[PDB]
């Protein structure tokens, strides 16, 4: 199945959760492809890709090359497709390229039909570009990543989520009166909430600095155990295709 | 002085800091206009604006109306210009309106030249739209908001910041060796880092739920004092 992950806003933990969930599914025996659809091109760094390695599916397209040559194998059952490094000129001029990347959709749709992977996870940016909407349309299921704070609370009342998305809380830690108030409120009111969450955990802060997914970095961390529970939930509930 | 504030990624605290810095500048005797340049239109909620109040400078501009009629008075020293509420369809089709907003730049240039306000603070989104670029061009100074984590660390090596921007840490907390390591590294290497920061602080989490700037909500909060230190530094260094 194709699974999109997209933060309700920036910085909520989408990329770290994508890399960790990919690692967990791979550990459960699944063949997994992870695709970074964010121009930040950060996902690769949870998989020990050198910062100076500029290649990626989008970089290859913009350079008139084959996006299939940009894949990297992390384990025998986990492959990675980085976005590629954009120059500063490209970063600040998205109108020069965000319409020229639509070939990735038929490429991924073919890859999906081949069945070489049980899971294709897509780290999606929090933008409304054409390529984000098109990649979202290829997803069988989707996770909308939040943190328990007033900003996310507002966003849930005013912005669209992908249809059929479930909501996954990250970075949670009890003790804050206002965050606990919001949390209890969501429990009684947010119908799309998943039955598990990811706690704040220094393993989730450290694993990126160690350039590893959280489950490889510290397998007995609470957040790694929670990501594993999410992986099992995906296998049970997100296995069907659109 | 026109001061732009822009997170190096989403969620770092840009909007809460913008509302708090405006309040502090007011407490120091200054006249301030705060402009929300983010389509999320969240800044207004720190100033007790009803969620269902949809007006704002962009909402007016798209509706064919005078954007200058969408400003709101918060105190005698502090005015607010919300972005306005976009419909779901507008939010998912930024190409339908991102070029229809370019009059705000000339409008804010007129306001700047009038000297009506001593400070104009602009809450800027982290997109690469031409309007974000042009609003940044009329800022005399800018703050790039970060949190001390591996994500912002990577970003500072690969993405452009507004020219001349200084870097402001928010959400500094206890309990993270990796944060402390990155922080000590920044102290020796990040040339544009500001000499003060803002901690994670329950008052910065609560003030948005109370719909107030942090310094109005809890004037003796540690984070309100940290923002006041920031406001004093801006007075001394960003006045030109």
């Amino acid at each position: 199945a194709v699974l999109g992950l997209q933060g309700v806003r920036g910085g909520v933990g989408t990329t770290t959760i994508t890399a960790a969930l990919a690692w967990s599914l791979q550990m459960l025996g699944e063949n997994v492809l992870v695709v970074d659809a964010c121009p930040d091109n950060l996902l690769r760094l949870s998989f020990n890709v050198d910062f100076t390695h500029r290649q990626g599916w989008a970089r290859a397209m913009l350079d008139g090359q084959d996006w299939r040559d940009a894949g990297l194998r992390y384990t025998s059952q986990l492959d990675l497709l980085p976005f590629g490094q954009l120059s500063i000129e490209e970063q600040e001029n998205p109108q020069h390229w965000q319409t020229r990347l639509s070939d990735i959709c038929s490429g991924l749709q073919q890859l999906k039909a081949s069945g070489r992977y049980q899971w294709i996870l897509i780290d999606l940016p929090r933008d409304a570009s054409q390529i984000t909407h098109q990649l979202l349309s290829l997803c069988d299921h989707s996770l909308a990543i939040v943190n328990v704070d007033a900003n996310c609370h507002i966003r849930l009342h005013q912005q669209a989520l992908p249809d059929g998305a479930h909501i996954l809380i990250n970075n949670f830690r009890i003790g804050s009166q206002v965050q606990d108030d919001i949390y209890q409120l969501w429990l009684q009111s947010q119908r799309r909430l998943l039955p598990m969450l990811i706690h704040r955990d220094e393993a989730m802060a450290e694993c990126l600095a160690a350039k590893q997914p959280v489950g490889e970095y510290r397998s007995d961390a609470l957040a790694a155990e929670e990501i594993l529970t999410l992986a099992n939930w995906c296998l049970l509930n997100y296995s069907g295709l659109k | 002085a026109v001061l732009g504030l822009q997170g190096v990624r989403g969620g770092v605290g840009t909007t809460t800091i913008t509302a708090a810095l405006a309040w502090s500048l007011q407490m120091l005797g200054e006249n301030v206009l705060v402009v929300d340049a983010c389509p999320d239109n969240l800044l207004r909620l720190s100033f007790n604006v009803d969620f269902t109040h949809r007006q704002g400078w962009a909402r007016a501009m798209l509706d064919g109306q005078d954007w200058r009629d969408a400003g709101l008075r918060y105190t005698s020293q502090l005015d607010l210009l919300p972005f306005g509420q976009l419909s779901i369809e507008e939010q998912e089709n930024p190409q339908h309106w991102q070029t229809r907003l370019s009059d705000i730049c000339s409008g804010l240039q007129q306001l700047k030249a009038s000297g009506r306000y001593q400070w104009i603070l602009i809450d800027l989104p982290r997109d690469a739209s031409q309007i974000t670029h042009q609003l940044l061009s009329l800022c005399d100074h800018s703050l790039a908001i970060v949190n001390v984590d591996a994500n912002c660390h990577i970003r500072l090596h690969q993405q452009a910041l507004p020219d001349g921007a200084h870097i402001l840490i928010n959400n500094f907390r206890i309990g993270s060796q990796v944060q402390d390591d990155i922080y000590q590294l920044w102290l020796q290497s990040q040339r544009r880092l500001l000499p003060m920061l803002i901690h994670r602080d329950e008052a910065m989490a609560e003030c948005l739920a109370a719909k107030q700037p942090v310094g109005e909500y809890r004037s003796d909060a540690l984070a309100a004092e940290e923002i006041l230190t920031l406001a004093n530094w801006c007075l001394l260094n960003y006045s030109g």
Partner: peptide, 27 residues
């Protein structure tokens, strides 16, 4: 793309009275 499915129909009343932002969305 649609708005999240939110249903507002014991200690929630305390949180709603504590925080004007939360009271606003709840009614």
């Amino acid at each position: 793309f649609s708005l999240p499915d939110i249903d507002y129909a014991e200690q929630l009343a305390a949180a709603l009275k504590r925080w004007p932002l939360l009271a606003e969305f709840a009614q």
